[PDB]
């Protein structure tokens with residue numbers, strides 16, 4: 001029925017094995033159904049089985065008409081948009097995913113300010129910086145009511161791969177227990193509402209004492225401890241992201257990053273998801289190597305490149321330099337070849 005874990009691997013539609021997928025944060029904010037279906041059709045014919053999307057869109061005032069928004073935080077209250085320019089846009093993504101046999105990872109808030117994020121909650125509820133979000137009872141109450149509304153809305157759908165706490169949560173210089181405690185509380189809350197659906201964190205994978213080279217990502221300065229959080233009983237698999245160019249490390253360092261997380265996942269007895277990765281140049285050679293490493297690493301059960309691209313009714317989808325567009329040479333290297341390789345395992 002719902003997607004699950006089987007040892008260090010994932011199971012989808014009764015098939016247990018390695019899976020390739022991708023990210024499209026923008027799909028739930030499109031307003032044209034044909035574009036959503038165009039994307040889902042292309043993912044299906046590409047063999048990409050997991051699509052990670054943003055399940056949040058937070059604002060502190062109603063946006064100009066026509067702009068999609070999911071939740072408004074104003075006058076000390078949080079209001080959820082269930083209209084045509086609100087959660088009905090995510091509904092179409094979920095429904096199209098069901099039709100096209102695609103499973104979705106849907107997260108509930110951004111650590112970053114894009115689409116509001118924890119900062120929009122802090123603006124409305126009070127405090128300073130994203131870190132106050134985690135321990136604020138009023139913000140956690142609003143965030144949990146949003147979670148409940150979303151989770152219950154799709155309770156009868158088999159297309160949700162996993163509920164994810166947030167995109168890239170960090171707690172700079174915080175004791176690792178702050179995120180540990182918030183992850184435990186939030187994942188328990190989600191499991192109470194939807195016991196059979198997998199839950200994951202959505203973090204970058206920082207804080208790792210297995211085969212550390214002492215570099216920034218392995219250290220604990222961002223408030224994260226990968227092995228400690230992966231032991232939470234209500235977390236089903238670990239997540240790691242990979243951006244050497246943003247972290248000041250080499251491209252080859254990315255393979256060790258994947259290998260080390262695989263070792264931690266094996267030890268925890270749970271799969272790891274390489275949930276985001278990208279570079280803005282030399283896509284095929286660099287990312288192809290990471291893909292090979294992820295596939296061959298015990299403990300790593302799937303990978304999603306950041307990010308998918310397509311030619312929509314409105315022109316090409318977002319290009320942040322990491323985008324790999326359907327039907328291009330880089331797409332053949334990083335999708336057609338990778339999916340073929342996985343199937344030839």
Ligand SMILES: *[C@@H]1O[C@H](CO)[C@@H](O[C@@H]2O[C@H](CO)[C@@H](O)[C@H](O)[C@H]2NC(C)=O)[C@H](O)[C@H]1NC(C)=O
Nearest residue numbers: 175176177207209220224225226227228229231
């Ligand atoms: C991160 O979490 C791990 C547990 O997953 C902590 O590792 C333990 O560290 C102590 C010494 O500090 C060792 O005696 C244990 O054997 C370790 N357990 C392991 C690795 O399984 C680590 O200290 C934490 N670091 C933080 C939060 O800064």
Ligand SMILES: *[C@@H]1O[C@H](CO)[C@@H](O)[C@H](O)[C@H]1NC(C)=O
Nearest residue numbers: 150151152153154155156157
């Ligand atoms: C789920 O299905 C049940 C029974 O078929 C129904 O009563 C419930 O309202 C549905 N929930 C939805 C569509 O969110």
Ligand SMILES: [Cl-]
Nearest residue numbers: 328329330331
């Ligand atoms: Cl290309």
